[PDB]
Amino acid sequence: TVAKAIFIKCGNLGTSMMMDMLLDERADREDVEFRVVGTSVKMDPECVEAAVEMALDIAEDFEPDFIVYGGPNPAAPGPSKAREMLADSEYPAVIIGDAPGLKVKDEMEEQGLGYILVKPDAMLGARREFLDPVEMAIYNADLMKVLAATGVFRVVQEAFDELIEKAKEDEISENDLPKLVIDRNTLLEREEFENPYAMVKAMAALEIAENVADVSVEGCFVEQDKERYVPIVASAHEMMRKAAELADEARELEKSNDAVLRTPHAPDGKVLSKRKFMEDPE
Amino acid sequence: TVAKAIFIKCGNLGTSMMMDMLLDERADREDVEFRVVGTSVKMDPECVEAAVEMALDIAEDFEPDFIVYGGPNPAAPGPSKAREMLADSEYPAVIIGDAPGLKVKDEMEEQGLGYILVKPDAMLGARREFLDPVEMAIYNADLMKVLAATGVFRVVQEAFDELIEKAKEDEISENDLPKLVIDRNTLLEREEFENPYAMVKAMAALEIAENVADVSVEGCFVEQDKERYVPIVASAHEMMRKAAELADEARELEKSNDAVLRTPHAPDGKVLSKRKFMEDPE
Amino acid sequence: TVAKAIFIKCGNLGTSMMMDMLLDERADREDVEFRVVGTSVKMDPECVEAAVEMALDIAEDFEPDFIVYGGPNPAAPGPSKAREMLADSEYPAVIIGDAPGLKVKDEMEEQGLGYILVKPDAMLGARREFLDPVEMAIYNADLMKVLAATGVFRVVQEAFDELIEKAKEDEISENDLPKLVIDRNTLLEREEFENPYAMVKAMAALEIAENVADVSVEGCFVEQDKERYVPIVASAHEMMRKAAELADEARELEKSNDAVLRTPHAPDGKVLSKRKFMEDPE
Amino acid sequence: TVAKAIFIKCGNLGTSMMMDMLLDERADREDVEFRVVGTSVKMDPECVEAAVEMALDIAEDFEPDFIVYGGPNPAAPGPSKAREMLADSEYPAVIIGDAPGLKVKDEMEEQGLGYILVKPDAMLGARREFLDPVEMAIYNADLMKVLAATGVFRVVQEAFDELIEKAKEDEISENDLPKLVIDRNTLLEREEFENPYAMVKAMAALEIAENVADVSVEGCFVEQDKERYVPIVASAHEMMRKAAELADEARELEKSNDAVLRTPHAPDGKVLSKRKFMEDPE
Amino acid sequence: TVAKAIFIKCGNLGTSMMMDMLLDERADREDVEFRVVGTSVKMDPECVEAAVEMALDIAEDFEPDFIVYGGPNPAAPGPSKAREMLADSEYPAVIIGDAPGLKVKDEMEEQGLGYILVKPDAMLGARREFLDPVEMAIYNADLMKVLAATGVFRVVQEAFDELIEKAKEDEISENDLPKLVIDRNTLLEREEFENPYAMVKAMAALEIAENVADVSVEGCFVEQDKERYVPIVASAHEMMRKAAELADEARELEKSNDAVLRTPHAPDGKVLSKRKFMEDPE
Amino acid sequence: TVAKAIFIKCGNLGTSMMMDMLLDERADREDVEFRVVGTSVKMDPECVEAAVEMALDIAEDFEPDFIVYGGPNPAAPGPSKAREMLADSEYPAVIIGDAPGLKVKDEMEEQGLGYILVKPDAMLGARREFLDPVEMAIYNADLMKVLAATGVFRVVQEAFDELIEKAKEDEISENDLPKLVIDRNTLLEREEFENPYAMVKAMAALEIAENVADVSVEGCFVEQDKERYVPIVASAHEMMRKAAELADEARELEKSNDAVLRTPHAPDGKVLSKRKFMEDPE
Ligand SMILES: [Mg+2]
Ligand SMILES: [Mg+2]
Ligand SMILES: [Mg+2]
Ligand SMILES: [Mg+2]
């Protein structure tokens, strides 16, 4: 049984940027096939629709078990446009978004949509005077580390793999669709870190990443004084740089304990596990 | 006028992952329109062909000024195939790959297509016993930081931006296509850094990332002993982690001098520029 | 003219812990005389009452031109007790506290009191499981580095030094009493740092120290599960240690420029100033 | 039952600034009660006298089991005075000071009072050109982090906690008064660290802390050349800054082995203990 | 018995600098006696010969069991002259060198000479515009840190100690002379690190150090543009500096596990061993 | 004219390890010619005498303009024999040593000997239980870093460079030989650092390095308790490691200001100078 899916990427979110590859890390998974379509960073209602179109168009011949839409803020005009377009289609779907999507959480639970909401996947301080192309990449590097090293990506990966198994049953009922809200507190009900302090550091790191969103919003929308909003959006980035460093420190702690949890995929798509470095993943 | 292009992403590369977004960081560039399609990590000749087919098929009603294919090693089966196809299209193309693509560098200039080969966009330690989803994201986060902070991404940004202008002139000839190879010494032609040690550190960070590739290749393809190849690929990731630190340290030196070079796009697509934090992009 | 004041300290805060010393760092000011009194970490309406009485008690003979009450949460049973005792007395008072005092901010202005609220002065995760004397001290160590190196203490110092000038006018009216609410944005209005990146790292530090409260409260007053609130009060700590790191960084950046602002008191209470290490303060 | 003590503080010391708070970290010990009074930084024999009388004056209604005087150089004019007074009172006393108080170490056990001499509690570089309120605070944050994380505070905690138990016994004899001198070698008699290197890093931290004293004393009392003494006291601060990094490092090693010793006070005053994070204080 | 050897040092190499010392670390061995001669940094033919001549002159009365010649590039004129002179004597000789010695590896074997070529012992950026004494000393401090903490020096000590035993029996055949080529992979099969991440970080450090070689060579012998080769050689030095931090990071992991291997010499020369800090060597 | 000198190395000191090499950092000086002899780490009278006799035997035909003897404790039996032997010869001699050489400063002057005593060149923790070959090399790596990056080596280079010029004129009188004692305050009067904080961090580094000496002596010649001296000598090393980092932070402060001092030799021996990276030495 070969499962299939289509990821639609509109806008830019750390979780959307990795979501699919967290599933096929070495491109050796022979139990799955993906198609990814998007219009880049543009998430306007015009483009957002053009993408879902390419998605439905392709799905015709492709025939996926489900379609994932990932992008920032599921409550915006663009994402909302696609949020509805997918509920109308014949394909089961999941919505990957940030905290700004809790506003439409109940709405998505009714639209019959599945979703994964990453609170710590904060919006970057986009203010021409500050966020140029390089700064953008830099910010996403740090956010990527935080989400990766804290275990958030493993939580996402396990969600999309637990669904691909149900997809193999060609029966993805709305009860089989994910409905997650990831945040610092998530780690409290997991076993990601063998080292306790490595866990509270990952937690402290997630709280900070979440706090970056408010700072970015204030500086991008509320504040309009150039002499005050440029410093604000930049202070948001300095915070994420520390969030990442906190995440890196946690990992190193696992390393010292030789307990870095690794869970790769076998060619058959089975999720294997290991703690010790020289221990085979079984 | 407005320029258009389509990005195809098969397999993953640090540049391939950010290429499109590096041309519209805040998504408020009204003089460009992008589309992105691919098969994720998979890059075998079948998924590749199916992908290039997805791009050509949509290039019909999209009518792109140029098609961009990004992914690891433009000399392997999958990538070579995609070079064959796009080479024989009414659409001008550009190939984005790493160092292993220097083998087919002449064959490409022949196929009448442009290329951007980033030497420091190393191959990761893809070995089931070491690379799981999380570790795969941890690495890309280090590579992203080194590629961005060392100014490599600025090189690529400039590239596709200068092409977008000649594309608005409805004059995309092969003399206008890029034939670039990026490595540690690219920074010597640049003015990226104002502090001499920030550049020297960046050069160091690039040299190290470029070296990472030989280590990943060895562990994945040459060493056959489990006890030896797992430590080797892991050490390749330890090198990339330090390259990122060096890059970050280069960035902080620039902050120290208040000379952080920023080149954001104006709403019309023209690349502005500034050094001082509160300088206002001119 | 020798101004005099009495500091009443109940419970603990980083701002109350160093408030009087920021006014005579080397004990060489011959224009001031302070009398500090407190009941230690206990701030119940019972102890708090005994302290204010002990303060008004000696005040008669001392003759302070103003009295300062410092301790956490101005809207608490103890603090509110002392908050009315001072409004009733014939001594001009100023209330120094954390964010929880904002609920009674407008209430203090009618009581005729002055106030300075240090938002980043967050309450620690005081759970018997995690917080012991050593952990408490470590916490305040980081918190101190934050309030100091971020420039917050130079705000408190400035506020009381200006009040000490009015106290010399033998005229401290309600309009001469401070009414400040310190937070991350407070730096946007000052010229503390010569380096713009030092300030944004400072903002980031005060932004994270302020968030620390939310976590401390969630783990001390909301969460009841032992397996959860311990990791919670401990994660709040990591946040503070990392915030102290960013403060340190900002301070080091000003050092690489030798633009480290220093403002010492002359023996006559005159506040001098200097940026360069080798320049004498004027 | 409940024990009571009064803490007198003139001038500042890292140990005096924390002593009473190291006894009731969470303010939930209902088996003790303390009063705190002082003159702040000032510590001349007059300000000292006034403060000691401010403490004797309230010991009447307070009726303390023992009085404690905290401040630098217990052999100088100010402190010598306070030794006189408290020595001849119906209240048992304890003197907490630094290394310069080893001169009067004989005279103290003579005056019939207990002492706590912290050699690593070095004097800071007091020179108007270098030390402003902030530098003053920053220095204490470093000395606070060293004394706490190196386990020195644990020594003082237990010292006053053990005295507090004999005080509830209605029997505070002079053979029950403490006679201790804390130094790098004090850690050789404890079991503070489960990781030997953390111990060795802790010793190094305090060894460097002790030496900070001579650099300070020199630049303040010996060198009279501006161009030489400013850099000298500054170097004492730089040294202490590094000692704080060493102490932090010791702490982290223990976090890697999850052996962080924690000894909180039970609500009834009896000190508990633990090593593992989720262990629950026994 | 007492073994006797003569070490000739011409030119400078991290390993030739420490070689003899690594064998009698505390100068309390009773089974060895060494003589060291050389011409400092100069390794031209005239000098090398003068140096080897000094050695052979001392050898007459000193009667060395074996002779060691160490210094850069065993294939250069000066070194080659040394190989010819020592291969022509009655004394068993070992050549200590860098990667460039591989060119004459076959030639040294035909000469009955032993050798230990350390590839990570990279040449420095010897350009007059960049390399002054201080920098030359800083580079070597980092290279020394690398060669030691990664375990490369233990390999060298071992090779020699074994040759010292054979010498004690007056049984040193050409087949008893070492023929080693040390590099990153050499660590894969040692019992150096108890922590795997320490080993991995040590390999990463050796890989980088080895790479420094090419960069220095490029900026010293290839690039002729002042504006190009200066930043180039300097970047080589930034690399070594980071290799040293990796080496230190590996050493700090062992400490966290209290598994720092220590193989000290007994007064009788026997090589003891230990792992735990408090564990006595045996 | 070519200047000739012979360096004798008995025992090991950071300065005696690098002294001759600091005088010809790239091996391209045409005005100097050196011969280096020694008995490695052994500095007992028998060895030191053989070392000096080797030197005097060479001097016959080599005819040095001056001779330098380097190694620990000029006052010990071995070094004392060297002093006596050298004082009785016709060759102007200099004695390089550490703090212990101060005991015989008066003797050396009465002997017509020159000397350079580096107090920060501290003795290591030479206890069999803690110091093996690798730890001995790690300590030296840090010591070298401290002495080079703080500029102590520059003072040494200077002293010998001036002595070399006089030698070229065959005019080296006893009054021409150096009589230096280097320590933290030596830096106060040098044009080493452009950044004041760089100089202050360096002083701190030298202060601590000096302190290391006392700690090593304590654990080596005082404490006889295995359980106590082992931790103590190890703490000495931890101190030197931190001193190396201070020295490293200073150097990085200079880089930030692109003000790193480089005083390389010209092919003719002239000591050039420069500050800016791209500036040419002159
Ligand atoms: Mg032979
Ligand atoms: Mg032969
Ligand atoms: Mg003479
Ligand atoms: Mg004489």
Which chain F residue is nearest to residue C251, measuring alpha carbons?
Answer: F197
Residue D275 identity (one-letter amino acid) = R
Smallest CA–CA separation between F175 and chain E, in Å?
Answer: 26
CA distances for D202 relative to B214, D118, E236, F124, F277, angstroms = 41, 15, 35, 19, 39
Q: What is the DSSP string of F82-115?
A: HHHHHHTSSS-EEEEE-GGGGGGHHHHHHTT-EE
Are the beta carbons of B232 and E188 separated by less than 8 Å?
A: yes
**Contact list, F245 vs chain D (CB under 8 Å):** 242
Q: For residue B139, what are the contacts with CB-CB under 8 A and spacing of at least 6?
A: B124, B125, B131, B237, B240
Closest CA to C166 of C53, C5, C277: C5
Cα torsion A170, A173, A174, A175: sign: negative
Smallest CA–CA separation between B141 and chain F, in Å?
Answer: 26
Smallest CA–CA separation between A265 and chain E, in Å?
Answer: 23
Which chain E residue is nearest to residue A256, measuring alpha carbons?
Answer: E253
Residue F241 in tokens: 């490691």
Check residue E69 and give left, alpha or beta (phi > 0: left; psi -120 to 50: alpha). beta
**Contact list, A196 vs chain D (CB under 8 Å):** 258, 276-278
**Contact list, B278 vs chain C (CB under 8 Å):** 196
Cα torsion B197, B203, B205, B207: sign: negative
Q: Where are the beta strands (DSSP E) in chain B?
A: 3-10, 32-40, 66-70, 93-97, 114-118, 179-182
In whole angstroms, what is the distance from residue B240 CA to residue B131 CA? 14
CA D135 to chain centre: 20
Q: Do chains C and A touch (3 or more CB pairs under 8 A)?
A: yes
Strand ranges across the sheet with E32-40? E179-182, E114-118, E93-97, E66-70, E3-10, E32-40, F32-38, F3-9, F66-70, F93-97, F114-118, F179-182
Contacting A with CB below 8 Å, chain D residues are 255-256, 258, 260, 276-278
Q: For residue E187, what are the contacts with CB-CB under 8 A and spacing of at least 6?
A: E150, E151, E193, E199, E202, E203, E206
Contacting E with CB below 8 Å, chain B residues are 184-185, 188, 196-197, 199-201, 203-204, 207-208, 211, 215, 227-228, 231-232, 234-236, 238-239, 242, 245-246
8 A C-beta contact, residue E113 and residue E94: yes
Cross-chain CB nearest to F277 (options B196, B256, B257) = B196
Smallest CA–CA separation between D156 and chain F, in Å?
Answer: 22
**Three-class secondary structure of residue D158 per DSSP:** helix
In whole angstroms, what is the distance from residue A83 CA to residue A45 CA? 11
Are the beta carbons of A33 and B47 separated by less than 8 Å?
A: yes
Cross-chain CB nearest to C277 (options F196, F256, F257) = F196
Q: How far is the CA of C59 from the centre of ligand 4 (A)?
A: 76
Backbone dihedral angles phi then psi of residue F141, each to the nearest 5 degrees: -60, -45
8 A C-beta contact, residue E142 and residue E212: no
Q: How far is the CA of E58 from the centre of ligand 4 (A)?
A: 31
In whole angstroms, what is the distance from residue A8 CA to residue A25 CA? 19
Resolution in A: 2.4
Smallest CA–CA separation between A81 and chain D, in Å?
Answer: 47
**Contact list, B227 vs chain E (CB under 8 Å):** 188
Cross-chain CB nearest to B256 (options F256, F276, F278) = F256
Backbone dihedral angles phi then psi of residue C180, each to the nearest 5 degrees: -110, 145
Q: How far is the CA of B105 from the centre of ligand 3 (A)?
A: 71
In whole angstroms, what is the distance from residue E48 CA to residue D270 CA? 75
Smallest CA–CA separation between F110 and chain E, in Å?
Answer: 30
Which chain C residue is nearest to residue A245, measuring alpha carbons?
Answer: C242
Report the DSSP beta bridge partners of residue F114. Answer: F94
Q: Do chains D and E touch (3 or more CB pairs under 8 A)?
A: yes
How far does chain F reach from its first CA to its final CA, in angstroms?
Answer: 21
Q: For residue B6, what are the contacts with CB-CB under 8 A and spacing of at least 6?
A: B34, B35, B36, B37, B55, B58, B59, B62, B64, B67, B68
**Cα torsion through C213, C214, C217, C219, rounded to 10:** -110
* Chosen from A22, A41, A220 to mutate, greatest number of chain B CBs within 10 A: A41
**Contact list, C236 vs chain A (CB under 8 Å):** 204
Closest CA to E14 of E271, E260, E213: E213
Q: How far is the CA of F177 from the centre of ligand 3 (A)?
A: 11
In whole angstroms, what is the distance from residue D153 CA to residue D29 CA? 18
Backbone dihedral angles phi then psi of residue D164, each to the nearest 5 degrees: -60, -25
In whole angstroms, what is the distance from residue F88 CA to residue F112 CA? 9
* Chosen from E195, E197, E249 to mutate, greatest number of chain A CBs within 10 A: E197
C168, with CB counted inside 10 A (0-12, 13-18, 19+), is middle
In whole angstroms, what is the distance from residue F57 CA to residue F5 CA? 13
Which chain B residue is nearest to residue F260, measuring alpha carbons?
Answer: B197
In whole angstroms, what is the distance from residue A24 CA to residue A253 CA? 27
Touching C (3+ Cβ pairs <8 A), the chains are A, B, D, F
**Contact list, D260 vs chain A (CB under 8 Å):** 197
Smallest CA–CA separation between E50 and chain F, in Å?
Answer: 9
Tracing tokens 């009618």 back to the chain, one arrives at C110
8 A C-beta contact, residue E79 and residue E52: no
In whole angstroms, what is the distance from residue E15 CA to residue E13 CA? 5
Q: How far is the CA of F82 from the centre of ligand 4 (A)?
A: 16
8 A C-beta contact, residue C82 and residue C69: yes
Query: Taking CA B113 as the corner, what is the angle to CA B110 and CA B119, rounded to the nearest 5 degrees?
Result: 95
Q: CATH 3.40.50.10830 in chain C: give the residue spans.
A: 1-123+151-182
Closest CA to D277 of A204, C132, C212: C132
**Greatest Cα pair distance in chain D:** 59
Q: CATH 6.10.140.120 in chain E: give the residue spans.
A: 124-150+183-258
E158, with CB counted inside 10 A (0-12, 13-18, 19+), is middle
Q: For residue F279, what are the contacts with CB-CB under 8 A and spacing of at least 6?
A: none
Give me the CATH code for the D124-150+183-258 domain, please.
6.10.140.120
Q: How many residues does chain B have?
A: 282
Q: How far is the CA of F66 from the centre of ligand 3 (A)?
A: 10
In whole angstroms, what is the distance from residue E194 CA to residue E174 CA? 35
Touching D (3+ Cβ pairs <8 A), the chains are A, C, E, F
Closest CA to E219 of E238, E236, E206: E236
Q: How far is the CA of B131 from the centre of ligand 1 (A)?
A: 52
8 A C-beta contact, residue D48 and residue D105: no
**Cα torsion through A246, A247, A251, A253, rounded to 10:** 20
Are the beta carbons of E197 and A258 separated by less than 8 Å?
A: yes
Ligand number with the minimum distance to the CA of E110:
2
Helices (H), D125-225: 133-149, 152-167, 196-217
Task: Say yes or no: domain C1-123+151-182 is CATH 3.40.50.10830.
Answer: yes
Q: For residue C263, what are the contacts with CB-CB under 8 A and spacing of at least 6?
A: C154, C157, C271, C272, C273, C274, C281, D132, D133, D134
Closest CA to C184 of D144, A128, A234, D135: A234
In whole angstroms, what is the distance from residue E10 CA to residue E18 CA? 13
User: Where is D3: in which H helix or E strand?
Assistant: strand D3-10
**Contact list, C242 vs chain A (CB under 8 Å):** 204, 208, 242, 245-246
In whole angstroms, what is the distance from residue D231 CA to residue E141 CA? 27
Cα torsion D188, D191, D196, D201: sign: negative
Are the beta carbons of A208 and C238 separated by less than 8 Å?
A: no
Contacting C with CB below 8 Å, chain B residues are 255-256, 258, 260, 276-278
Are the beta carbons of E195 and A278 separated by less than 8 Å?
A: no
Are the beta carbons of B12 and A21 separated by less than 8 Å?
A: yes
**Contact list, E37 vs chain F (CB under 8 Å):** 35-38, 54
8 A C-beta contact, residue F51 and residue F10: yes
Smallest CA–CA separation between F254 and chain C, in Å?
Answer: 8
Check residue B280 and give left, alpha or beta (phi > 0: left; psi -120 to 50: alpha). left
**Contact list, D27 vs chain C (CB under 8 Å):** 11, 40-43, 126
Report the DSSP beta bridge partners of residue F262. Answer: F274
Q: How far is the CA of E166 from the centre of ligand 1 (A)?
A: 15
Q: Where are the beta strands (DSSP E) in C101-256?
A: 114-118, 179-182
